RNA sequence: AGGACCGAACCGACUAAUGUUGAAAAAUUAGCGGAUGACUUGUGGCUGGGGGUGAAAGGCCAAUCAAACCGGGAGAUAGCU
RNA sequence: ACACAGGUGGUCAGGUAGAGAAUACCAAGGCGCUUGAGAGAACUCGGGUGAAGGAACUAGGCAAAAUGGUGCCGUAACUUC
RNA sequence: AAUUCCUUGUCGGGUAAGUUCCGACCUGCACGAAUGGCGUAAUGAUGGCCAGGCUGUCUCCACCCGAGACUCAGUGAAAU
RNA sequence: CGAUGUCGGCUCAUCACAUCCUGGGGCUGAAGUAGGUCCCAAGGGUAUGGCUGUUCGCCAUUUAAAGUGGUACGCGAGCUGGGUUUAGAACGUCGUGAGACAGUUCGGUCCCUAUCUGCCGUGGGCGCUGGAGAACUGAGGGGGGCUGCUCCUAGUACGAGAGGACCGGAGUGGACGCAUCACUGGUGUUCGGGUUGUCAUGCCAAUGGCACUGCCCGGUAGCUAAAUGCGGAAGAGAUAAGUGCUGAAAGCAUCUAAGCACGAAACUUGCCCCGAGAUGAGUUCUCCCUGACCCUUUAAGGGUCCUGAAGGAACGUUGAAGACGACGACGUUGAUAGGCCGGGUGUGUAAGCGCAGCGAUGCGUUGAGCUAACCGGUACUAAUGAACCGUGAGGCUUAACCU
């Protein structure tokens, strides 16, 4: 099963249309340390909702 | 369910003995022969047991003129209304599906004294 | 199909899951913490808090049943030594799961899994 | 006929004295609400919309908070819908109750079915299957042909392939009614009816018996 | 459920042991014979002297099955055999005068009163 | 004792399945036959193209054989595309 | 042609079972075979089980399923014995 | 008949049913005696038929265990 | 012919009517059942086996019936390779011979990850003229439409008799589909137990690993069929063949030219499902922000500050929802998931101890121990305070009303 004629650029763009990315809607900030880290994820450091665990 | 178990209550039978399995059971059940009813008797071995509730069961197996039959008993059913022990058997499994390839002098099993 | 089951394959047979988790298992029990990925941490969590709860009563029995489950004479000590009446007093929830981001390799989710009672 | 919405709970039996036991899906339907009546003149037909159950305070949106205050109705967990004919009149906060099946001996049971996912063209169509043996190739569950060849030379519309299986709306009519209770809120229909326990299943009268 | 090319024990005493099926009455697509379910069957292993000879091809009912029946309260009764009894092509009755072995209530018709009288147990 | 038997190494490839822009320009798995003899194998040598060899299939002769490969006649000829 | 599921001659031969270099588990010793993680649709491949019938499927018992070892009683037609 | 077009030649056996199989009839299109004929103990990864057991081959499929297929991260072709 | 792959078989169907059954009717040398012929009608259904590679065909037994043909003698980028049709070999025949035989016999590589149309299903974007959350009207489209047997009517009508009714009801079943796991069973390599070989835990005991889940015995939930509930309609409108009423042209007659009525599983509704992108973009109940500034291009204009609502989106716990998307529930004002308590189910008297027996072993503690997906509860843990998107009263013309 192979093609039969060349495609075009146009329909090569409109497949590749929904093949694009979403960045990051918004981040989150601990109250004490002042950083940005994922949501219900942890900082570089060892924060979460304050705490330190590492 | 909370519900499911309220309603299937109501119709449980409270007069159920305790049998475990391989015991020789006798069970009357019910039979209407036209306009009348009357009693029926089988008497077996009790090769299986199935603990639900209300959808108990519990199956009987006997040789009967010289052809095996099994029987299954719904527990909590009208139309069984005695159901005794005769002899209680000692084994150590709860279904005894092995009394089905054997007959004869090779299927007996021992009682269980207590 | 998968309607009301319970378990996850994790690309393993059952051979490779069970010894993967007993290792997973000691592992952390002999540390403390540990990191792996998520679905790995959520599964030990079914594993380990039984084990800990039946280490939460004293006896030969029992320290025979997790010799049998976890092969370590070293960790089924600790774990009925200083596990049970750490956690004698909790119902359950003997785990505590930290989202720690992705990984390089493979971009895998990954997961700090530990005892609450640690620090 | 005046249909309510009920909350199935799971299948059971029951036995009678004759040494009959009977299947039965147990409904669980609640005082249903009435939210709003339409009428000929503004919507263009006689219909009444009703909900069951409660919902969090804290969840249930603001136009629907409006929408139930409008009626002094409680927030449910739905709204559903029921066509009316002659003689037939209600107000806007009525309950109805399970009450109004005293009479009713077959009733129409309308709900989603269970959901099978992305089914093969045997389990979806009740297909059959090739030999498994004697040299067949990687064709042992496959549909086979669709069609002809060069007339038409292309794929009727409607045909039987695989597919979505479940996660439908399923109606199963003349369903044999056994018990009312009005004092535990239940329902007792012999038979199956379609969905899993805890969905909403809509029970109306039958409409031909 | 007896279908075509099974084999049955015979219940009667008309000479046969072994027969096999070959039809299902009832309709088209038939596959599934139960108690009382006319059926057609041809004979393998018959004794020397007896009312049938091997090869005859004739009717027979079923009043023992492995499968088993079912009562409506759910309770069924199955067996450790299939078993048929033989009948004739036209007036469709038996022909030996002894059933062996026991049968089943749900048997007992307008049609088959001569098999439960002859029954020495009917369940 | 046996061109004896069952069955491993070893040799071979009868059936099925996988694969067939393959792990592989003939293989993999489950089975299979011979397996002390007309057996197999290592090393070395000899037999060559109208010729060699061939328990004989038009089979093999360096993945190519109803006449091997390289160079030359040669830009053979082609009423053919 | 590849860090290729292929081919390549000689020697050493451990233990428990076991007739044995077959097979299972292991010691000395050597490896996890250079992309992983996740959920657990149709469908493909390697498999396991199965209510009743048991070749009715099929060109065809193809495939699959099944007995399968030691000791002992005993074993037909036919025969170049 | 490994040979017979007419042919599924006719009879018998096996099967409830047998253009396949076996034993006979001879009307051998077009067997035949060392480009050998008849039979034949043992043997065949040989051709055909029947039987016992055996089973998802099927009646009619159902579930489960793993590798692919599905998503994410990286490398990244092809026939046309 | 710088390749359109071929007979038969399996799966998969679709269309047609010169119809096999069901439906209605006319004639009959149609007393009745059972029949023969013809017209209308395609809504549904239309068999299993032995032989052969075979379609075809013969036979056995059913069926209400076992239709005729087209679709590249339908369908090999769906399967098969039995035959036909390559290279091997043989028989019969011909040819002095290499060889030939739609004469026969044994054996003999069927590749393709789907680019486009099509189809089965699931989504993103935008629009429907302010936005958002819900319930619907249903233009239109799709699914199904089959029937046997027994009894009553009635051994009545009919027939000198065997024989045996039309119409109309009741019941039970076969094939088909939808739904479900309560019951009957399968699976259940995540539960329990028996047992062989071997290794290991310093050793006995007790366990773990491997040998298809090592080989087996049962089995929770879930999924299932062989299991159990349901359906095929009743009824209405307009009709074909057909039967008619009144009634002239044609003083009669005449179903028709005016007019009226009956009439089939054919058609539209009626039963179920999808469904306003139905751009002709629909209807209804609700909710939401009623702040100021300047600039040329004076307008459906551009920009600044403040404001960020209803609601949605994102992350997380997740689901009897699901390929990824999507949908549903929950998120500290909470039972969403995991864990835990109790119960239930399943497996089957756990380990240890003591006693009896030289011993294997049995007995009491003990229906004990273990118990996955089940139920009723429990915040013990993980679902965070936030942030983001989405705005700030909604164009022109005309008709009615209020100012
Ligand atoms: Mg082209
Ligand atoms: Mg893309
Ligand atoms: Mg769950
Ligand atoms: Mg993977
Ligand atoms: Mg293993
Ligand atoms: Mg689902
Ligand atoms: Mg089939
Ligand atoms: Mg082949
Ligand atoms: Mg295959
Ligand atoms: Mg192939
Ligand atoms: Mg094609
Ligand atoms: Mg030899
Ligand atoms: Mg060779
Ligand atoms: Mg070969
Ligand atoms: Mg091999
Ligand atoms: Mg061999
Ligand atoms: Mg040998
Ligand atoms: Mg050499
Ligand atoms: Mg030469
Ligand atoms: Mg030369
Ligand atoms: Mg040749
Ligand atoms: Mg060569
Ligand atoms: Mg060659
Ligand atoms: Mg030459
Ligand atoms: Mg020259
Ligand atoms: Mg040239
Ligand atoms: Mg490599
Ligand atoms: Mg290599
Ligand atoms: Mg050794
Ligand atoms: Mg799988
Ligand atoms: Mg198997
Ligand atoms: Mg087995
Ligand atoms: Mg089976
Ligand atoms: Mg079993
Ligand atoms: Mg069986
Ligand atoms: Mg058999
Ligand atoms: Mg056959
Ligand atoms: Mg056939
Ligand atoms: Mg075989
Ligand atoms: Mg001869
Ligand atoms: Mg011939
Ligand atoms: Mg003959
Ligand atoms: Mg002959
Ligand atoms: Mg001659
Ligand atoms: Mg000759
Ligand atoms: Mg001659
Ligand atoms: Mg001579
Ligand atoms: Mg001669
Ligand atoms: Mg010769
Ligand atoms: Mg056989
Ligand atoms: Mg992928
Ligand atoms: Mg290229
Ligand atoms: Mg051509
Ligand atoms: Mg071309
Ligand atoms: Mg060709
Ligand atoms: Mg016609
Ligand atoms: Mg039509
Ligand atoms: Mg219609
Ligand atoms: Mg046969
Ligand atoms: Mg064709
Ligand atoms: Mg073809
Ligand atoms: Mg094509
Ligand atoms: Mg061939
Ligand atoms: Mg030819
Ligand atoms: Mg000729
Ligand atoms: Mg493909
Ligand atoms: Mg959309
Ligand atoms: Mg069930
Ligand atoms: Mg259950
Ligand atoms: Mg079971
Ligand atoms: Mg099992
Ligand atoms: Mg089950
Ligand atoms: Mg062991
Ligand atoms: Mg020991
Ligand atoms: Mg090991
Ligand atoms: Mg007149
Ligand atoms: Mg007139
Ligand atoms: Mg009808
Ligand atoms: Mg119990
Ligand atoms: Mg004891
Ligand atoms: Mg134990
Ligand atoms: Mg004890
Ligand atoms: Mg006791
Ligand atoms: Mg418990």
């Known amino acids: 099963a192979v093609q039969q004629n060349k495609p075009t650029r146009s329909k090569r763009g409109m497949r590749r249309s929904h093949d694009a990315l979403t960045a990051v809607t918004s981040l989150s900030v601990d109250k004490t340390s002042g950083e940005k880290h994922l949501r219900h994820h942890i900082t570089a450091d060892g924060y979460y909702r304050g705490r330190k665990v590492i | 369910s909370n519900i499911i178990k309220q309603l299937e209550q109501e119709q449980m039978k409270q007069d159920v003995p305790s049998f475990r399995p391989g015991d020789t059971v006798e069970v009357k059940v019910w039979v209407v022969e036209g306009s009348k009813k009357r009693l029926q008797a089988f008497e077996g071995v009790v090769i299986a047991i199935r603990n639900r509730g209300l959808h108990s069961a519990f199956t009987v197996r006997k040789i009967s003129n010289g052809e095996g039959v099994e029987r299954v008993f719904q527990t909590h059913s009208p139309v069984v209304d005695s159901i005794s022990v005769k002899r209680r058997g000692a084994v150590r499994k709860a279904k005894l599906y092995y009394l089905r390839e054997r007959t004869g002098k090779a299927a007996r099993i021992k009682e269980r004294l207590n | ?119 | 006929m005046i249909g309510l919405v009920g909350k199935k709970v799971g299948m059971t039996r029951i036995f009678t004295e004759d040494g009959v036991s009977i299947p039965v899906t147990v409904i669980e339907v609640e005082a249903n609400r009435v939210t709003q009546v339409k009428d000929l003149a503004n919507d263009g037909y006689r219909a009444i919309q009703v909900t069951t159950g409660a919902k969090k305070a804290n969840r249930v949106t603001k136009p629907e908070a409006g929408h139930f205050a409008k009626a002094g109705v409680e927030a449910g967990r739905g709204l559903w819908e029921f066509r009316l004919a002659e003689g037939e009149e209600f107000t806007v906060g009525q309950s109805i109750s399970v009450e109004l099946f005293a009479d009713v001996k077959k009733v129409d049971v309308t709900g989603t079915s269970k959901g099978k996912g992305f089914a093969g063209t045997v389990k979806r169509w009740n297909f059959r299957t090739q030999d498994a043996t004697h040299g067949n190739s990687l064709s042992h569950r496959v549909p086979g042909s669709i069609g002809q060849n060069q007339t038409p030379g292309k794929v009727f519309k409607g045909k039987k392939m695989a597919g979505q299986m479940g996660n439908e709306r399923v109606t199963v009519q003349s369903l044999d009614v056994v018990r009312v209770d009005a004092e535990r809120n239940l329902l007792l229909v012999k038979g199956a009816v379609p969905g899993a326990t805890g969905s909403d299943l809509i029970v109306k009268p039958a409409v031909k018996a | 459920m007896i279908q075509e090319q099974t084999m049955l024990n015979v219940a009667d005493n008309s000479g046969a042991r072994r027969v096999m099926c070959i039809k299902v009455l009832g309709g088209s697509h038939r596959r599934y014979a139960g108690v009382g379910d006319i059926i057609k069957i041809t004979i393998k292993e018959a004794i020397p002297r007896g009312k049938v000879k091997k090869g005859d091809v004739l009717k027979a009912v079923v009043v023992r099955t492995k499968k088993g029946v079912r009562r409506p309260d759910g309770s069924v009764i199955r067996f450790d055999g299939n078993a048929c009894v033989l009948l004739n092509n036209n007036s469709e009755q038996p022909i030996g005068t002894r059933i062996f072995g026991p049968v089943t209530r749900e048997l007992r018709s307008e049609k088959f009163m001569k098999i439960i009288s002859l029954a020495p147990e009917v369940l």
Do not use: W
């Open chain 3, 1 to 119: 199909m998968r309607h009301r089951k319970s378990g996850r394959q994790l690309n393993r047979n059952s051979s490779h899951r069970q010894a993967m988790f007993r290792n997973m298992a000691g592992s952390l029990v002999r540390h403390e913490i540990i990191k792996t990925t998520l679905p790995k941490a959520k599964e030990l969590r079914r594993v380990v808090e039984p084990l800990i709860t039946l280490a939460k009563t004293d006896s030969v029995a029992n320290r025979r049943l997790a010799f049998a489950r976890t092969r370590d004479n070293e960790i089924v000590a600790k774990l009925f030594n200083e596990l049970g009446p750490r956690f004698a007093s909790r119902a359950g929830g003997y785990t505590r799961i930290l989202k720690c981001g992705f990984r390089a390799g493979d971009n895998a989710p990954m997961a700090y899994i530990e005892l609450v009672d640690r620090s």
